[PDB]
Design a binder for this molecule. Sequence first.
Ligand SMILES: N=C(N)c1ccc(/C=N/OCC(=O)O)cc1
Ligand SMILES: [Ca+2]
Length: 223
Amino acid sequence: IVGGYTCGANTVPYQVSLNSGYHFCGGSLINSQWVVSAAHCYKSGIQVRLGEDNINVVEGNEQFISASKSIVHPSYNSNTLNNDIMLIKLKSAASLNSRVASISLPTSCASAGTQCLISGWGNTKSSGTSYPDVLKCLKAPILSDSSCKSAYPGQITSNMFCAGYLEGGKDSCQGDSGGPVVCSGKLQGIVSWGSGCAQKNKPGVYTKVCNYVSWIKQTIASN
Ligand SMILES: N=C(N)c1ccc(/C=N/OCC(=O)O)cc1
Ligand SMILES: [Ca+2]
């Protein structure tokens, strides 16, 4: 997260870290057994880490649970990043408490102009690299579809939306991939792509979760 703020320990209790010997992506806990992340975060041997603040120090509230299965969206296209969504099933149910909690799926899509909360342990610089210890947060508005399409001509599908600041300076970034965009208490987006981070006229592009609720529900009802 570039140009954000320190969230505060466990204030984003649905935020997870995906670990494969190191943190590599975020995700969102949607019930005791399932995490939503980006399909571009797919790899074998994922351990889901819940209740994290400092990802490099065991602070006492963590639950580390191995993934039993990963299900990439059937229409995910890694070239265009269309349908950039994946479900990860935990080997055992997380124990839900104040510091580890699920986030609601949307019943309707979010509105342009709505301020959303984006979070992660990704790069905090727009040029150069610096990775934070503790979870970072950014409040960012959903942009109009026409401004989103103008920013990325020929690349924005109906399964994507833009959020952020056209002036630059505030954005998600590498390492935030797969993490939450929560608007009005609903998981509305997944950190997906963008040209660099926090670049002028290049806002963040996010998987449009409201389009996938049917697939999510049917998948978790059968796996
Ligand atoms: N909002 C952005 N500008 C943005 C967000 C996410 C990415 C994804 N990078 O994938 C590589 C990785 O995370 O390791 C790029 C740009
Ligand atoms: Ca920790």
